[PDB]
Design a protein around this motif. Structure first.
Motif, mmCIF file in Angstrom:
data_model
loop_
_atom_site.group_PDB
_atom_site.id
_atom_site.type_symbol
_atom_site.label_atom_id
_atom_site.label_comp_id
_atom_site.label_asym_id
_atom_site.label_seq_id
_atom_site.Cartn_x
_atom_site.Cartn_y
_atom_site.Cartn_z
ATOM 1 N N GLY A 210 0.844 -1.338 0.063
ATOM 2 C CA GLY A 210 -0.133 0.011 0.088
ATOM 3 C C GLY A 210 0.900 1.392 0.022
ATOM 4 N N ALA B 101 1.074 7.396 -1.052
ATOM 5 C CA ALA B 101 0.339 6.265 -0.861
ATOM 6 C C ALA B 101 -0.042 5.648 -2.096
ATOM 7 N N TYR C 204 -4.794 -5.076 -3.313
ATOM 8 C CA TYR C 204 -5.374 -3.827 -3.146
ATOM 9 C C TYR C 204 -5.337 -3.700 -1.476
ATOM 10 N N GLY D 132 -6.087 -4.790 3.361
ATOM 11 C CA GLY D 132 -7.120 -5.336 2.161
ATOM 12 C C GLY D 132 -6.876 -6.555 1.786
ATOM 13 N N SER E 119 -1.526 -0.523 6.704
ATOM 14 C CA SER E 119 -2.338 -0.581 5.596
ATOM 15 C C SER E 119 -3.321 -2.131 5.774
ATOM 16 N N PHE F 19 -4.556 3.059 5.579
ATOM 17 C CA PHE F 19 -5.652 3.708 6.297
ATOM 18 C C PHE F 19 -5.072 4.551 7.493
ATOM 19 N N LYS G 244 -1.595 6.800 8.298
ATOM 20 C CA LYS G 244 -0.584 7.388 7.458
ATOM 21 C C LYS G 244 0.145 8.740 8.148
ATOM 22 N N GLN H 113 -3.001 2.701 -2.638
ATOM 23 C CA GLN H 113 -3.999 1.671 -2.114
ATOM 24 C C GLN H 113 -4.023 0.479 -2.918
ATOM 25 N N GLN I 283 -5.764 -0.346 1.129
ATOM 26 C CA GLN I 283 -5.570 1.277 1.378
ATOM 27 C C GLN I 283 -4.825 1.614 2.662
#
Lengths: 723, 67, 218, 371, 91
Positions: free
Chosen positions: A575, A712, A700, A684, A682, A704, A706, A714, A702
């Motif tokens: 990510g 970034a 994938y 996913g 991150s 989330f 940061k 995602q 994200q």
């Protein structure tokens, strides 16, 4: 007549191929001799097949047209209404439990719970027999030694779609395992067999426990070399005492000797690369654990998609056996292991490439070779690695790698400078245990630096190194001669060598500069991956992964930045741009001694700020901590776990990088890198497919959580990594 | 698919059997008996007149036909 | 792919396509001909054409399956020699896989099962049908394939010598003598059994194998 | 994803609406939670103006027949003991005689309940669940089970007097058939095409005129034939076959009196000479006992999952699994009237007695009907 | 050359547990030898009807241990020859 085509229509994907098989059993086939009348007669057999599959409502029709000289074209049309819905599973005679507990363990179901709607309540007789056996195994495990399954019944409704199934059972009473007796020719191994037999007389009888007792007796006899002993377990029962004395009868048989070790299916992997993974030697008494460890080592090596073991008694000979290892090779004849096309792809609007070859098929001397040539960000990096996992068959590996690297800094989070690096490493690795490997190595590196845009983090190293560069000048030059004692440590135990299911891998890499080296520092790296089979079934897995790193200067020189750690690539932290994570490159103000007006280079004072300056550029960090927890599942498709062994995962990544020597106190006016609690995260979906080219990876996730300046992405895609 | 449109008979790999395969024999010293040849892996006598694979044809024979 | 044209036209055009080397479309056309007209006398000839096309089109598993089918349908037939030769050649060709082995490395010690089955089939061909035109090339392939098997055994013996499983080395070289006595591989292997026997302090047996190597050094 | 092509075979639409007489509900009451997507014989009963009804949960209700006033109610569900509470899983019809009410269960228990009181008199274990409607005969309760075993229980105390095995295949349709008694013997039907008679004493076998005429090569075509309550008059037995042949039999011996091609049949009622019969294709027809000849036939309710037919107020009356109730003329063979009474399900058979017509829905509610 | 490394505990040859060694007697035929000791994993190929029983181990990388038990038979399989020895050292 003869038939030009036989076609099936109306099938709701229910075993279309078996319909041809039903016709074959019926004596007809494409071009086979059948007439219109017998076609109608045989169509009943298709109804019979759909009755057997549970579609009791099904009926079938035939449509046919002759060609002008008695050649026939045939279509078969099906009616396949809803059927086989189990409206109930009933158990009668039960008095020890509530039935709901018993039926809940069936594969079949009466009412699918809304709490977790898994599968459907569809009948299947073979699974009914399996579940009857599970019921019996449950009752025997709970301890009802006299348990009996009596005249199981299956019923369907005057409307045929409705099924419900009844099972009558008898219980008696649960019995104590009052004692165990083992008899026969044990060849003196009675003491350990007893330790297997060890039980508290108050223990309740258990069918599963006695079955595992037989299994472990077989295991122990196999270890000492009795491949095929006769092992029997027989209960001695008194119902007035309501206890079971247990009898085990054993014939150890002959000590089996392995006449031949045969490897099959490896059309390209040289036999030596399989045989040197053996722990059981040819021409020696068999060891079941030894053969199993050979299988496990073949799986661990990762060269082989499948590994199967068969033990065959030599034809007509009493005690000699052949051991046959049957394997399917990774990459299925695509040359040079897995072709490593390395890519930079994802949400990032940037492109990067790596090209390489891997593993087994290499020329003339039995070595295994890896090559890699890359441009990442605006870096140019190429390396050649030559390895022999068995420098001598005792197990000691030897490896030497050569590389060249270049740095150009047209953004891509690459701090503004120009640098060139090249070096070599010579490595030895010798296992210390079946599951441990220990490494020693010597490494040599040289570096030259120019167009050095001034930068606090790097300049901390340069300032302490001596020959302190002049601040506010865009250009400064430095050089380094390096010698390093490369060393490492490994623990490796895994099902397969890829998409693992059980075990763990721990890999520790560290280097220290030997005096005479300019850098005078040491750094340590730790890598760890752990796998667990969910519910102790390896078809369902959960992966725990972590990496740790530290590096500090022995003579106070801290570390040269060009060996700092990073994360952001899909291998480490999904990510993020490959190297964006961590401390950011704060520049000094400078007067653009070397400059190009076409570039908005960071913080050149004639255009930018006249004070210390942030940017998206990342200098990595002299410390690192990365973690990942992952959850692995199937996802059916025409290519699936069975057809291609594809893997997909739900996962969460935790990543953080920090600099131990950031002057948290002096630089209060800028972000304080000194604390690792600036955690990135991150989570996913990720996908991996073992295409003939090599391992594709898709994910994938994200980012989330940061921090400032982390570029970034995602989504991310790549191929290879081979390991 | 791409090719020179020839080698309609040979394998994709090395047809090295055409050469570098002399069946050097083994001889028993006086006083020792060597182990027996043990069955299938003996090669019987051969005519020696038939052509070899670089020229010999591997297309199926011209079987008669009817319908 | 191919409509229901008369079997004769389909066969003629498929033969043409075979002569043009259009292996894929040739295979499709003969497969369609077999599917629509397997009952007629063309079946056998179509079966042979399918066998050849599968072998040359590099569909070796399908070639082998078609060969098995033909042999099942025709236990006696004027071309059984050719079909057995084709089985041998298919299992032989299954070994030599790709270019990188062609220029790069010897491919004698990967897997003998294909080579060994091919050798057995060629043995059947040469023994049963010596007068057949395919005998001589079958004999040359038998010689090379037996040499390859012996080299595989030698490549196992060398490994066990390096590891030192001396009983395994002795057993393997003795097996090579039993099965592949007249090969260069075993002639080179015996100097290794001579070391293996001595490592186990079995002096007289090592002396006897030394006697053998003394004479067979020629 | 995949829902676009689910397959189901259609039932015939509702018949013509016009009616010679207008039926009406006298009263309706909820006995309890309904049978639901569940299939077992369970229907109300009547004797001397007191209704008795029950449902799967174990609730049992006694009600007046003129109006829905309750006499008493009781639940046979197990005491939970703070573990998983177990419902009675009730099945197997309701029967009454003198001082007792007899109810089966989908589990081993068969319960005896008092008529004037909710008191449980006795409950006894039997071999296999008593899916079949228990019957009373000469001081005993005769029961048939899903497991193919027939039990006779001493009506005074519920103790088992004898057991008789009737063979069943592994796929035996619904293992239900209610025995009947007359001329001093008890007739019984077994899933394996075995219509048989028993002495109704000491479990003594009389005869077994098994119907092998099914001749089902495939297992589903070999589906267990008989599931219906046989009936008797003039010492002549009449029986049914879900897949096989309707037949009329001697009751002294088992020999054939008549045999008919009719399969797909599970329920019927008898006039002095006319059989009134329901196909599982939901064809309805009137057949003479002698010669198996048709007075009338119609199939407008084809595949409607008809109830068992009963004769009430000079009309044949039958329900369906859709929610509608229909009257058929006794000899004209046409619909006399048609009605809707339920939206959920109306599968179990009606009962006609004491001048009342009673029915229990698939969803737990009883109705008293009149026309 | 010699170093501490996990040499995988090679076993070689037959098992000569002392009881089965004591089982042998000079009056046996080949069948009795096969029953008592198991099939000979090293049959003498070079003419003589000689059976060699070798029991060899090398635990780890130190201390090679071996027993050599040599048997010979007449052409009829009748036994008259025994040699029984502990082997000389290795690493």
């Amino acid at each position: 007549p003869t038939i030009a085509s036989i076609t099936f229509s109306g099938n709701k994907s229910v075993k279309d191929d078996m319909l041809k098989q039903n016709l074959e059993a019926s004596g007809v086939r494409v071009g086979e001799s059948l007439d219109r009348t017998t076609i109608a007669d045989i169509e009943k057999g298709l109804e019979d097949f759909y009755y057997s599959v549970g579609k009791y409502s099904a009926s079938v029709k035939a449509v046919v047209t002759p060609l002008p000289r008695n050649r026939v074209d045939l279509k078969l049309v099906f009616q396949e209404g809803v059927s086989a819905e189990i409206q109930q599973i009933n158990i009668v005679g039960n008095h020890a439990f509530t039935t709901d507990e018993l039926i809940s363990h069936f594969q079949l179901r009466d009412e699918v719970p809304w709490w977790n709607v898994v599968g459907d309540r569809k009948y299947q007789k073979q699974k009914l027999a399996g579940d009857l056996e599970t019921l019996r195994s449950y009752y025997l495990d709970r301890g009802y030694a006299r348990f009996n399954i009596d005249s199981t019944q299956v019923s369907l409704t005057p409307d045929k779609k409705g099924i419900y199934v009844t099972v009558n059972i008898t219980e008696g009473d649960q019995y104590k395992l009052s004692g165990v007796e083992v008899s026969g020719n044990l060849a003196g191994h009675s003491a350990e067999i007893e330790q297997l037999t060890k039980i508290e007389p108050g223990e309740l009888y258990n069918g599963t426990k006695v079955t595992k007792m037989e299994d472990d007796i077989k295991k122990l006899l196999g270890r000492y070399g009795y491949a095929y002993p006769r092992v029997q377990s027989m209960p001695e029962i008194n119902d007035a005492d309501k206890t079971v004395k247990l009898r085990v009868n054993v014939d150890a048989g002959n000590r089996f000797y392995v006449r031949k070790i045969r490897f099959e299916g490896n059309d390209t992997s040289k036999d030596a690369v399989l045989r040197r993974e053996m722990r059981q030697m040819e021409g020696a008494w068999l060891g079941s654990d030894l053969v199993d460890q050979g299988k496990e080592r073949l799986n661990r090596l990762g060269f082989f998609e499948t590994v199967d073991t068969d033990t065959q008694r030599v034809p007509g000979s009493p005690d000699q056996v052949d051991v046959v290892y049957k394997v399917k090779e990774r990459n299925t004849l695509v040359p040079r292991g897995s072709f490593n096309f390395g890519i930079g792809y994802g949400a990032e609007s940037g492109v990067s490439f790596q090209a390489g070859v891997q593993q087994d098929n290499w020329l003339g001397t039995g070595y295994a070779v890896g090559i890699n040539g890359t441009k990442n960000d605006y870096q140019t990096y190429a390396e050649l690695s030559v390895t022999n996992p068995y420098f001598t068959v005792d197990g000691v590996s030897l490896g030497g790698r050569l590389f060249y690297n270049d740095f150009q800094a047209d953004d891509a989070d690459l701090s503004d400078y120009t640098n060139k690096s090249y070096g070599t490493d010579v490595t030895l690795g010798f296992p210390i245990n079946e599951y441990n490997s220990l490494r020693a190595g010597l490494g040599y590196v040289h570096n030259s630096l120019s167009n050095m845009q001034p930068q606090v983090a790097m300049w901390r190293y340069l300032y302490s190194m001596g020959e302190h560069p002049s601040t506010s000048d865009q250009d400064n030059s430095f050089k380094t001669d390096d010698f390093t004692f490369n060393y490492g440590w490994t623990y490796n135990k895994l099902d397969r060598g890829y998409f693992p299911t059980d075990g763990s891998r721990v890999n520790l890499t560290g280097k220290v500069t030997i005096p005479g080296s300019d850098n005078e520092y040491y750094k340590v790296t730790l890598d760890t991956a752990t796998y667990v089979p969910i519910d102790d079934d390896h078809k369902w897995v959960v992966l725990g992964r972590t990496r740790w790193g530290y590096g500090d200067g022995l003579g106070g020189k801290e570390m040269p930045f060009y060996e700092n750690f990073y994360a952001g690539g899909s291998s480490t932290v999904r990510g993020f741009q490959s190297n964006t994570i961590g401390p950011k490159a704060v520049y000094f103000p400078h007067q653009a001694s070397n400059y190009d007006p076409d570039y908005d280079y960071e913080c050149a004072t004639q255009d930018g700020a006249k004070d210390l300056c942030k940017s998206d550029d990342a200098v990595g960090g002299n410390a690192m901590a990365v973690a990942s927890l992952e959850f692995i599942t199937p996802t059916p498709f025409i290519s699936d776990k069975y057809a291609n062994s594809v893997r997909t995962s739900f996962f969460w990544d935790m990543g953080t990088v920090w600099d131990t020597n950031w002057d948290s106190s002096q630089y209060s006016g800028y972000p304080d890198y000194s604390d690792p609690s600036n955690i990135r995260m991150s989570a996913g979906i990720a996908l991996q497919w073992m295409s003939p080219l090599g391992p594709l990876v898709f994910s994938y996730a994200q980012p989330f959580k940061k921090y400032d300046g982390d570029k970034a992405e995602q989504f991310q895609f790549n191929i290879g990594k081979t390991w | 698919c791409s090719s020179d449109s020839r080698y309609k008979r040979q394998v994709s790999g090395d047809e090295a059997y055409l050469e570098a395969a002399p069946l050097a024999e083994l001889h028993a010293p006086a006083g020792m008996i060597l182990p027996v040849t043990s069955g299938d892996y003996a090669i019987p006598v051969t005519n020696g007149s038939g052509a070899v694979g670089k020229a010999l044809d591997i297309r199926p024979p011209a079987q008669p036909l009817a319908l | 792919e191919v409509p229901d044209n008369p079997p004769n036209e389909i066969y003629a055009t498929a033969q043409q396509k075979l002569q043009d080397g259009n292996w894929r479309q040739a295979i499709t056309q003969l497969e369609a001909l077999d599917n629509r007209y397997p009952f007629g006398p063309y079946s056998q000839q179509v079966q042979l054409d399918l066998i050849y096309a599968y072998y040359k089109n590099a569909d070796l598993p399908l070639a082998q399956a078609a060969i098995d089918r033909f042999i099942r349908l025709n236990p006696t037939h004027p071309n059984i020699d050719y079909v057995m030769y084709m089985r041998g050649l298919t299992n032989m060709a299954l070994d030599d896989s790709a270019l990188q082995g062609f220029f790069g490395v010897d491919r004698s010690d990967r897997d003998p099962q294909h080579a060994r089955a091919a050798f057995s089939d060629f043995s059947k061909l040469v023994r049963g049908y010596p007068n057949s035109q395919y005998t001589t090339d079958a004999t040359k392939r038998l010689v090379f394939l037996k040499d390859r098997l012996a080299k595989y055994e030698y490549s196992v013996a060398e490994y066990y010598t390096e590891r030192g499983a001396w009983v395994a080395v002795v057993n393997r070289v003795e097996g090579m003598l039993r099965d592949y006595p007249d090969t260069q591989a075993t002639r080179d292997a015996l100097p290794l059994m001579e070391n293996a026997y001595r490592q186990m302090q079995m002096n007289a047996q090592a002396e006897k194998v030394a006697k053998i190597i003394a004479a067979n050094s020629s | 994803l995949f829902n676009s092509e689910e397959d189901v075979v259609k039932m015939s639409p509702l018949p013509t609406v016009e009616n010679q007489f207008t039926p009406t509900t006298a009263w309706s009451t909820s006995v309890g939670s309904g049978i639901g997507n569940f299939y077992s014989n369970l229907h109300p009963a009547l004797a001397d103006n007191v209704v008795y009804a029950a449902d799967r949960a174990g609730l049992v209700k006694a009600l007046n027949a003129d109006d829905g006033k309750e006499i008493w109610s009781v639940s046979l569900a197990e005491k939970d003991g703070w573990f998983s509470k177990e419902p009675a899983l009730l099945s197997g019809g309701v029967t009454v005689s003198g001082g007792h009410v007899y109810i089966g269960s989908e589990k081993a228990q068969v319960y005896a309940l008092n008529t004037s009181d909710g008191t449980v008199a006795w409950q006894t274990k039997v071999a296999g669940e008593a899916l079949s409607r228990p019957v009373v005969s000469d001081g005993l309760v005769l029961i048939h089970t899903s497991n193919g075993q027939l039990q006779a229980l001493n009506e005074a105390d519920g103790a088992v007097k004898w057991t008789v095995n009737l063979d069943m295949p592994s796929l035996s349709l619904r293992g239900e058939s209610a025995p009947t008694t007359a001329f001093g013997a008890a007739v019984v039907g077994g899933d394996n095409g075995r219509v048989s008679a028993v002495l109704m004493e000491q479990g003594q076998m009389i005869w077994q005129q098994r119907i092998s005429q099914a001749t089902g090569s495939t297992e589903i075509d070999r589906l267990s034939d008989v599931d219906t309550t046989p009936v008797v008059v003039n010492g002549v037995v009449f029986a049914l076959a879900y897949n096989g042949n309707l037949t009329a039999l001697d009751l002294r011996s088992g020999q054939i009196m008549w045999k008919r091609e009719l399969g797909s049949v599970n329920d019927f009622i008898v006039d002095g000479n006319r059989i009134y019969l329901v196909d599982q294709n939901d064809r309805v027809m009137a057949l003479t006992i002698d010669g198996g000849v048709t007075l009338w036939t119609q199939s407008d309710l084809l595949h409607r999952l008809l109830t068992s037919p009963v004769l009430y107020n000079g009309n044949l009356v039958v329900g369906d699994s859709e929610g509608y109730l229909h009257w058929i003329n006794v000899e004209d063979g046409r619909f006399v009237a048609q009605q809707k009474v339920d939206s959920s399900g109306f599968q179990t058979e009606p009962v006609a007695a004491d001048g009342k017509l009673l029915i229990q829905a698939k969803d737990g509610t009883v109705y008293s009907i009149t026309r | 050359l010699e170093r501490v490394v996990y040499r995988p505990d090679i076993n070689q040859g037959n098992y000569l547990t002392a009881n089965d060694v004591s089982k042998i007697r000079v009056g046996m035929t080949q069948q009795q030898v096969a029953y008592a000791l198991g099939t000979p994993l090293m049959s003498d190929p070079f003419g003589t009807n000689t059976w060699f029983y070798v029991f060899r181990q090398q635990p780890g990388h130190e201390g090679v241990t071996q027993q050599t038990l040599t048997l010979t038979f007449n052409s009829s399989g009748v036994l008259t020859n025994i040699d029984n020895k502990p082997a000389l050292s290795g690493n």
